[PDB]
Design a binder for this molecule. Sequence first.
Ligand code: HEM
Ligand code: HEM
Lengths: 399, 399
Amino acid sequence: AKCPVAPHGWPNPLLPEYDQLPEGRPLTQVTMPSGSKAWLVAQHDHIQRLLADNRFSVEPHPTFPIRFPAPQELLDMIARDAKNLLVTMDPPRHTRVRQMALPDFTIKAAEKLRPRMQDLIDYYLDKMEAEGAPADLVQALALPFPAQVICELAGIPENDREIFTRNAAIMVGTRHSYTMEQKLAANEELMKYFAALVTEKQSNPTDDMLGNFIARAGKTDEFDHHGLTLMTKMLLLAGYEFIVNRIALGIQALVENPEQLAALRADLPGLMPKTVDEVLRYYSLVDEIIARVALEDVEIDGVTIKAGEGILVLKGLGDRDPSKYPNPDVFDIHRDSRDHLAFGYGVHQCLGQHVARLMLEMCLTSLVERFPGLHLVEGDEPIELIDGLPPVHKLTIGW
Amino acid sequence: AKCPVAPHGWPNPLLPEYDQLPEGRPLTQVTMPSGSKAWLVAQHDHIQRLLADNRFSVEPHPTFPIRFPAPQELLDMIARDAKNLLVTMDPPRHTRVRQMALPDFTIKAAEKLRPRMQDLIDYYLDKMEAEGAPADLVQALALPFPAQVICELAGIPENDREIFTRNAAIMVGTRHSYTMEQKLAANEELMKYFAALVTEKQSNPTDDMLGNFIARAGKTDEFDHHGLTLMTKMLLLAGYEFIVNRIALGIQALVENPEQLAALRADLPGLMPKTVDEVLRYYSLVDEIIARVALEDVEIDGVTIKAGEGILVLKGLGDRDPSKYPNPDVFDIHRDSRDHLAFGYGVHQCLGQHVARLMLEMCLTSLVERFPGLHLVEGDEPIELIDGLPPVHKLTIGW
Ligand code: HEM
Ligand code: HEM
């Protein structure tokens, strides 16, 4: 019947880890390239219980689970900067640093962004509608719109935006869109820009997410300038790839399920929150693993995760867990998916989740309201495959 | 009870082409890296109808479907030696060259090998039982036994068989067993050995498969010495990786289905033929694509495959075709699998198929009989993963 598969047009294979579990997806111990041990965690309940457990850590550790062999020199450089990234800090330092940004990421603070966000969307759909009737939604909305929202978060003036848009789009593209050279260079330019932006917030403070974070951090001795630059990068780019893919894949799911799209448009107030939840849950399959290391022995359902052993949270499979979501591999906006794992769980659960939800909701609502004839379209020429895969993500649509 | 998935322990992902088809797996046109066009062919009926058609070609062609981007010089290299490989010859020449080896590959010819094969199997199985109950069937039998059979086919004397065996193992191992530098080393070692074996049979003829073919070839002007060397590599090594893995995959399938193992042991004469068929059919999924280019337009279903265009036959999906095999993704020795596609179809259908069938049958019969307690030794120890995959082919059994 229905199976976990990569979405149509997806330019990556699914994570091979998904194929490494017995039937029933029990906790499965594996040996990492370094000889360290980790556990594959794919059950929705196990993921929540383990990611809420204070005995697991995100910080560098001699047996932290690392999935590929890599030169230890640059392992060491990454581990040295982990203290400057919120996602690799444990509590209680994690708690204090997260609180420096948190007031600008609440539901109500995100909501304050809605009028500007609608202007951005209205802009992109005006442009899409004014040009040719067949459009690539990845290029027309999914890539550029969140970049602009990030600039609003960072108080970046409009003159500077078009060039951060350039480098952000390079970071997030496939290997067939931008070289390993153009990327590590666009990274360098972003890091230069982020350092100059931090400096600019320290003089002349501003009332935006980044400005208020920099200000709150300055009242402590928690970061030097290099640490504020890494935090700035994380706060602005940690979610870019995710939200880009969720916008395109969400619209793809709706046009691939026209009966649900028809029902959604008839009842936007009642079905849009569920639609957002279902796009979040269903496309966790194409998201990355969430990794931790145990600091103490952890017992769960008759298995012992020993201190120093990793857990590899197969987040996408947890959101396809049949005991939590009946017929889990069917996309269905009517299901109960409120408890999804797309944002993770526990203390590191996505700081940007309310900004992210609003971006996804507002994009889906606007395309659905504005294009009652919205449908999937084949395109000029047959699908390109390189090594059997689509080289870039695109979604060709008509209306 | 469905979902085509990689077998447990398989060190590669499934072919990404498998994921590029619409529901129903219709004939699906794609654009290759070079810009040429090809068709994805996954329906059992279509595969037979297209591979039967003499309008398709295996010979170099400006728009032959090539799945990866490639230097033209290395295309050139492959192209100028396609005259020397049966697998890249079209009829009429393909028919005449194949006749030079066919007599030693018939059902009757293969059956002549059964006495020697049984002594080979008994040797490896003695050595395995003696060496201790937890054994890796890949090392113990699946790799070396078919290498020996090839030695018997080529008339390779016993004093050379240890080196030939380890070199064959090198070329079929994953990138983690052996290096690409370590592999090309064994390639030219084997190509030197094959060119010396050609010379030896030209001066001291023999009645083995390879000797007969060299003699029959010498009665014509078809090959120079380099040609006979290439042909010798193909006739000896074309199926080695396939039969190695089928032996191991077949034992895994039987143990993973104890009720079918039990019925096989109770009725070996009636059920072993069907077991071989189903091991061939079911594991086509992990075999390679079959490719052709059209030399004229070919109409099928509703589609016209135009003269410049390729077909990429998704042989393994064809053997999972639901309209040909009910519940196709269930391994079931009791089903009708006689029409399977594992050996291909049409003029190029596997030359070694009868030797391959006998090797597989004899191995399964001897293992199943000799070790009543036969089971898999897995689930208790951590599996090694590199980049999320089993690093090497391995099948740990016990009895
Ligand atoms: C659909 C969109 C998004 C998804 C699916 C997503 C997913 C996630 C996940 C799974 C985590 C937890 C990783 C872990 O526990 O190791 C996380 C953390 C985080 N996300 Fe997002 N994210 C999204 C959008 C965003 C956006 C738009 C932003 C910022 C503008 C953002 C900022 C962050 C930050 C700063 C963290 C670190 C939180 C911490 O360590 O306390 N994310 N995200
Ligand atoms: C389970 C075992 C095997 C499988 C699944 C298999 C599969 C195949 C397939 C699918 C083809 C056709 C390729 C195409 O049409 O492009 C083929 C051809 C061929 N096979 Fe096998 N093979 C196996 C064993 C062997 C063995 C043991 C040998 C040699 C002793 C062998 C030698 C050949 C040769 C020489 C060809 C080329 C025939 C031609 O082009 O006319 N194969 N095989």
